[PDB]
């Protein structure tokens, strides 16, 4: 009957957010810094000789 908060609820306890839809209340921490790799540089326009086309 102790008030747990991790999910699923620990055995013999009850969740403090155990009411219907209550888990939507749990805090969320989205990082502002992504896992986003850089993309490959284009080299042809600097290697090549420029021309009117």
């Amino acid at each position: 009957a102790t008030k747990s908060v991790l999910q699923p609820p620990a055995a013999g306890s009850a969740s403090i957010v155990g009411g219907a839809g209550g888990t939507q209340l749990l805090p969320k921490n989205i990082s502002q810094e992504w896992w986003k790799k850089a993309t490959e540089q284009s080299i042809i326009p600097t290697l090549s000789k420029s021309t009117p086309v």
Binding site: T39, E40, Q41, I43, S48, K49, T51, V53
Partner: protein, 108 residues
């Protein structure tokens, strides 16, 4: 280029330079390198196992080779977007033999 661990590719980079400049009589004005070539360079070693170019650190890419400029991109190996890896690791040549331009550009 051979796959073998620790092999020197300098004989092969000079063979390609010779192919462009003598067998075809062109100039030579630089390289395009895949970044994966810098490991193959950096790990090249003697018949008794010492490094051939010990000035290459981990996390570097070479922007020059044998006095010729180099430019680095995995567009050289070609496993970019939906492309597979071609196994290409360098292209050398006279880059004045490649002329390029934009006819038109449409911005966002």
């Amino acid at each position: 280029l051979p796959l073998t661990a620790g092999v020197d590719i300098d004989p092969f980079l000079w063979e390609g330079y010779n192919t462009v400049t003598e067998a075809a009589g062109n100039n030579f004005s630089g390289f395009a390198f895949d970044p994966r070539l810098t490991y193959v360079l950096a790990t090249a070693r003697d018949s008794d196992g010492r490094r051939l170019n010990p000035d290459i650190n981990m996390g570097q890419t070479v922007t020059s080779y044998s006095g010729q400029p180099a430019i680095n991109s995995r567009t050289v190996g070609g496993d970019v977007d939906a492309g597979t890896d071609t196994g290409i690791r360098a292209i050398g040549g006279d880059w004045d033999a490649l002329r390029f331009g934009y006819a038109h550009q449409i911005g966002l």
